[PDB]
Symmetry: D2
Subunit: 333 residues, 4 copies
């Protein structure tokens, strides 16, 4: 009616029977973990007084997540293979839900200069993957067997129930979809609560803005190079495409969601299969974009049609406005 | 933990700055704290009341109120879509503060960050007699000479972190806002921008509108050197955001001229001058492609100029291609 | 660290409260966070006695906005030197929230502390007319007084104290829970479960300036408290003047608080429905007693619009002691 | 328009009223108070992972850290159920700050409010040198070095209640600063505060009535007499020295902590509590007495010397002195 907080909104969806009380608690706990991580990000410079500065924050953030979700279930960590961010996987005691949580969107200080964010996906599994806990088991680290079970149990195309992200920038924004549209919540610094600021967000069908790291231009295929060249051609009013690339996956994606356009992390000569991980990053983002009326593709097929088969599977990503993604797909055919 | 207040009082005690300037700097930081909050709650405030356009206006009012104990403030109205500038002139006639409330008027460019930019000058004449007229603007230009009477400069970035960067003539100092206690805390002393950095910040969407000079330089940055590793490209669209990242990690930022804008888009007095002074204090370079920005004296207040700023070796490289 | 939000969601899961009431309670705590800020900045906001009265009004508007998604709210105007009460009636007709924005209209009594008091009832009719002057008339006040019965349909009650610490005290029928606001993260954190007020406590809270206006009954009780027992230590006297502040201290450390009747106020000053009822329900859940000097406050059925009653509240043994003097 | 403590201090410095060194001391003290306020607000939470006494020690540490650029600080350990006092001596030897971190060591008395009290002196000598505690030789030095009657330059307190208030006097009036929770800065909300000449409000712990002298009992009894109209005095007693004093300063009246059968010389300490409060009240146009004489006129002899206190509106204090003669 006037002020709708995340708590009130979740309780309303529950009354409507859209989600159950258990999921209401999981989603509410995730947002609480995000409030704390936001604070960690804002004070990082200060905390470091009394560059692996972004790599240590990944770890502390995963511990904050674990503590906030201790009443729903146990949490394990899928260790970083390369320069990847370690992923937190929480499995409910009841066996009804599994939350795959990406604490921050990167491990680079440069890419986190102005923004960063958390990404999560909630699945409804058939199995129990995580074992028990430990007395002096300091390492939460999941083993080859447990990492395998999670990859097999979490299926983007058939059991992803909810997805969202929380952006930490000049504003702290919580974006969520429980299967019926995208909802945007803004954190009120004053009262420490997420306030509903946008319902049923729709990403524009088109937008003359492209987000790619053009420093890798000579490492791309001739397909992609021509697409990139043609965007620089002043079409109509004699106005070419605008280029914007923060380097922050959440920041670039959020801007694409609000103003339209296309974001891309293609494959190149060094990263033959791209860089973004299919299960941890691309799946949740693609589900969200599709709920907002957009498209998430790997250049040829729909990302959500790809079944994860490897622990750290990577894939190229073209996401954003439908007409823009369709345009890049025509050049890559 | 040294706060901005404690740090300012120590500089004053050292005779580096006088009490009056201590008050001006302290008031500016107070205005930035408030503007930061406005930016953080923009979405909510808009639920009950062109979003970055009126934020410009409210921010200028916050500035005026915080500096009312130092002097009076006038507003230099925006021509096109540009940001209205606040000019404060001390009652004593010793200082003039040129304040750019926000770094842009576009929602797109302010999606993740924005910021305030200011410069403090020691005038010769008294210009201020809400909006300043042509006669006052003319006076402001002749009085504020970036190349000789710019005493202090800085900016406040509003992003995942609220950062206050300041220079009073002897190095660059970085202050981070503690959300907890509402105070700026010194987190970096005598900041030095790296001499080189393989990162370039340009809007490549305008590539075909650039001169063949510049196109050549941009193309060569994509050549994987002897490591099979090209330059990285980063461009937020936020002047304060892109500049700050360049200041901490090195590289080059550029806002060149094009076919339809023979002189670029960034304003010389309001944006380029304070940024150039800061970069030079950190050991870097601020050029228009051929000369030092601080060597240029505006003839008109709204004068614009191309900008190439960042690491010394990177800026020297672009100058060589533009010769 | 269990926050109020997590705690409320846990009670809603156990089926102790329904989702609608979870929203009402969550909205009230939100309203209290905002009111706390208004109180902390009052001196500054006024740079732009009756500073307390104006705060009463703004606080009621904050309450209304935070509860607009649950129902409509009317205001029972401040006739005398009483605080205007906000009454919110849910759209569904299942709940009514009687909200006292601040505990007084005096600057003197709010020098160091103040607070909000509320009670949630499950009515048997509709009283709020319509809106969308939200002041409730004589007929609407009558309906509310009949519909709100502290002894049978008061489901939840609590208060939020604004002092050197911001404390939210709540009871949903199964014990008293204390939540402390973390200035840092803007969230109420559970700091005490199932609070129990001591059975006795040698501390009395009365305005002794009115001593010569009291009955000889009360004067005698007051006199005997000053007698140092065989330990050589008499009762300690503490009186802030803030109802919420004096009550809270009584709840944590024990003792007795009283606002008796006197020659000027033959029926006491505190209002039965808006102040005494919620306070008595809370004290009883913490293991104490709330009396009017002769009977249990919650046994008295509100029959008038501006009904007042004397109040003796606190530790069971202390309240039973004053009743023995007044009999 | 909006004046912060920093701007106000800098203006007094420009006016030559105080020197830069004192400007830093006062600025540093207010910084310690912002931190102590936060400790008080989160006490219940911090204790999750009796409570007033441990808070006394941490507060003194915060004070020491904030004043490390001005001088060194020692601690005068609690003799009984008192609060340990922090004494800071400037490196230059120009100033000594006597800081009482909290106004009590009782949880009951701090249920709604508490506060810090400080006094700044200009000594004729140099006292200070596991135990950052001052010894017998150092304690005997401070008592003789700090004379509230002649060398007390500035005094004030910071109240932690529903509002965080910083009250200060540098010799030319009392000034009130309110902390803005939002921007973390003290804002000037009242200049040259004047305590009313009379006030029909009294602040005493009447639970000790039968332990008082017949003098005082008579005074206390007569206040209950509905005089002229038919309205007797109002009674208000929080139990918090800073809280009760602050209310007396703004609305007038009388506050008293007399001597009783149990405490023959009163409970409040002369140097640490009564001296700063009396200086402030006199600057606001009020009176601070021990019942027979002006508190500031008395000279400390013992390190923890105590004295009865009657402080507040001039006419009210003069009235009690009339009954105690």
């Amino acid at each position: 009616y006037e002020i709708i907080t995340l708590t009130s909104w979740l309780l309303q969806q529950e009354q409507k029977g859209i989600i159950d009380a258990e999921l209401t608690i999981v989603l509410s706990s995730i947002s609480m973990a995000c409030k704390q991580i936001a604070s960690l990000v804002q004070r990082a410079n200060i905390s470091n007084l009394t560059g692996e500065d972004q790599k240590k924050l990944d770890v502390i953030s995963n511990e904050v997540f674990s503590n906030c979700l201790r009443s729903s279930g146990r949490t394990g960590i899928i260790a970083s293979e390369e320069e990847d961010v370690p992923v937190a996987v929480e499995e409910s005691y009841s066996g009804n839900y599994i939350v795959v949580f990406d604490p921050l969107d990167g491990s680079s200080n440069l890419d986190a200069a102005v923004s960063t964010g958390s990404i999560f996906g909630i699945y409804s599994p058939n199995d129990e993957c995580l074992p028990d806990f430990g007395d002096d088991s300091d390492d939460n680290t999941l083993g080859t067997e447990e990492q395998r079970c999670i990859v097999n149990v979490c299926q983007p195309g058939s059991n992803l129930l909810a997805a969202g992200y929380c952006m930490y920038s000049s504003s702290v924004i919580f974006v969520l979809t429980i299967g019926k549209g995208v909802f945007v919540f803004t954190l009120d610094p004053l009262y420490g609560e997420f306030v509903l600021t946008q319902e049923n967000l729709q990403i524009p069908k088109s937008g003359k803005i492209y987000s790619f790291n053009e420093g890798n231009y000579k490492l791309w295929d001739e397909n992609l190079k021509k697409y990139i060249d043609d965007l620089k051609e002043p079409g109509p009013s004699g106005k070419p495409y605008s280029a914007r690339y923060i380097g922050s996956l959440v920041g670039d994606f959020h801007r694409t969601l609000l103003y339209g356009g296309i974001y891309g992390y293609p494959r190149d000569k060094k990263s033959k299969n791209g860089k973004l991980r299919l299960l941890y990053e691309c799946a949740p983002m693609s589900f969200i974009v599709e709920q907002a009326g957009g498209k998430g593709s790997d250049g040829h097929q729909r990302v959500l049609d790809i079944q994860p088969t490897e622990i750290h599977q990577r894939v190229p990503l073209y996401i954003g406005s439908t007409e823009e993604v369709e345009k890049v797909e025509k050049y890559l055919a």
